[PDB]
């Protein structure tokens, strides 16, 4: 039942079944060859009466050892090499999917969790394929094979092992479960106490000022004391568990080996048959260890194969069907548009606007008021809940998302840069050709060239986490040059959120104007004073919009709706409004 | 050499040496009793000729097993119980030290690192005391004892083990070191690749907008490929290492047990002497495992005992010698005061001021300009580099730090609250008696009572990390009530840094005035407009101070020094200065 999705998943990578089957066959043959070794030692030891020592018998044991090792090396390489092919194919599929999942997917799901899945689930599956299946089969063949060979030479001494091994395990298991429960509880109390100490130490500033020396000592002392009480409770458990595990193991060993010796010493058995018996006991206990591990692995494996298949079945973004845009700067109408993540809550509704060729329109309104939805609707970062976005007089969902994203340009504050060269960032993702003589003809414009020429290298710095740190103004100027190299007909601007420094800001404002000249521009911001020059402002009413005039008209005949943001500004200052 | 600081450290806890010595003696006796068991099994097995089976011989083995387990339970409890006493004593010493280390210590050293030390070093030392020393001694006695008993019954078969065991180890060790090196390199490349994927995923916003789909796919594909290449290099190592470990172990076992059988089968040995030989081999291999672990533990232990002793030898704050203050609101002079963390850089120098009875003085100046040093000097959070702080006409270092911290009061923005009750916070650390009828007579003042009475409980909420989250204004009002319950003669105020919300701020300003009335107040802040009412402002010049007048005098005859902060404000707004 559960093995049909795993198999299907493995088949997605078009694996070579012959090579895996042959490797498994070699493992099975390696285990069967490992059951000859104790019979050949018994034949050698039984044949040592009057000390003949036939050299062919000790040489044949070496030939069988080198043959077992040669086949085990081949099977182990083949299994690992194909597992490495299978896992590589899985990761390539998962990565090609992730890069095409709609930007909605990363809005709902954590990027780190997705990375964690593609890096761990594939690993689990690998581990299952390369080691655990072959380990499990070989262990079963080794265990049942060894017991069958033992019962055919001396059934009394294996009947004893088939009582001693289960009765020893029936004791050690519960005693071990009980032990581990106490280890977890002391770990948790250790954690609680470290947490408590951590929490007191950064507030030492007040503790000192308030004369709370004995008070904070005493609350820490109660933690020392609760840890000590659990430590004594662990001591009273570990003192019974330790001696009892050693008592059981040695009583099992003495019982098995002493009855082996008491058969050889009476004549009911030979010296070489006892030798074979010990040599097989090691071939019972260890693979029995192996097989047990298979099942936990199998559970984890199922969960992984559930998550990966989940990703690789999800919807991907249809970026490449529709028309091609001609004369793209034409009027963007919204007419009866609407949105919500689910129809339970319509985040934006009954909206209409026009956005005008070569002008600016500014989305500015209350913090947390949903205003970011209209911006994400206009850049196609989100599909409307059945209401029209229209360019000129054609519904915008007509044009291909490639032919849309090509005639849009995009810039933000708070941006990092792509790990790569500075010329690679100044021309990122655009498949048109570029040249040294024009890539800096886009960079002199944002004042990027005459900044970049002062760095240790004029085309690289390993920008981002590897290279030197850059200030927000430098990062913005690098973004503004990329958009001048695309020469988009429409521009989407994310001017600021959170908080920022005003250092060099007037030179950054003079850098920004370059890009927005003579093309249609849509801006989103957190304050009115940054937006005083705009040809239409849009105020946001937690689901609906008004304003639809100059900044001054908001200051003249809007009133209370300016006051619902301007009061929070006037708690700090008049923000250069001077009114 | 290295054992003299550990021992001294252990002696600091006044441990019971008799009980540890007796537990170690019991462990040694338990190991010697564990060397009888295989001789008694040999006597039983050798005595089984003609199958007499004397019941006293199989009963005596059980009596020796229950005696070994009884003494092992007692020794194991005693060792763990005394280790739990020793570690508890260590932690109590370390915590009583930390709480008294000067506030300078936590300024240089990370609190988390100190917690980590007191929670891990003590543990390491515990582990060494309870398990590793006894484990090491018992292993040596078990190993040398078992080998000495083997050589006295059959020296040929132990001479073989004393060649087989070292020659097997001389192979497995290097092959294992080499194996682990490849496992580390693949871990690192896995980490590098996850890091790379992580770094791409939160920037999916641009990747989509820029048409960088094949570009970001290909950079990820190169990571899949480098991981696959290292995976194949690991496969070519694991394929030789696995077979070779199994080949060696089985060749060692076959050689030892086959020569055991070939002695019994020729008559050079008995069936029971072979049984004893196997039973002792297990008493050689496992404690040899144990002893090896002792040394790594010993190294770690030394490092721990080095850090803990370091803490427990450090200087602690002399909080309780000097005079007692009378009439504490008198003039605080600074005259030729100076400071620095080291004399290499004098952070503040040649400073003089007066701070005046029942007035306000405000420390306001450039960000990162060192101004926080003068505030920390005035509250005695730091000693001057030989220049006088003086109250009335007495040097302030005359009064006890208790009798100082009692006549000071202290409040800050950005503060958390002590984990505890709300009545416990409103009266924190003060050793004077309090009553329900007066603790709320301090709380009605900050408007704290009529806020607290609306919570689910009127005296508790488990405030901080356990309970409900509180806003900055509520936390400030709780702090302001504590200072009214102390009724300090002098007040130290940290008004704001970083960033804050203006929500309810005018009601918080009306709450703050309550505390500062009719007592001397020192304030530190980040903007001039918050401080317009102050009777003296102090501007800071990266080592020296001026201003020494009203806010308006800074606005009238200071000029360029107001401009060196006011310009950065005027990039945003005039900040209600209206000039």
Numbering used by the authors:
A (entry chain A), B (entry chain B): 10 to 588
How did the manuscript describe this experimental structure?
pmcATP-binding cassette (ABC) transporters are ubiquitous membrane proteins that couple the energy of ATP binding and hydrolysis to the translocation of a wide variety of molecules across biological membranes. Here, we investigated whether a large separation of the nucleotide-binding domains is required for the transport cycle of BmrA, a homodimeric multidrug ABC transporter from Bacillus subtilis. Upon ATP binding, the NBDs engage in a transient tight dimer where the two nucleotides are sandwiched between the Walker A motif from one NBD and the ABC signature motif from the other NBD, thereby generating the OF conformation that is prone to drug release. Overall, our data suggest that the NBDs of BmrA function with a tweezers-like mechanism distinct from the related lipid A exporter MsbA.
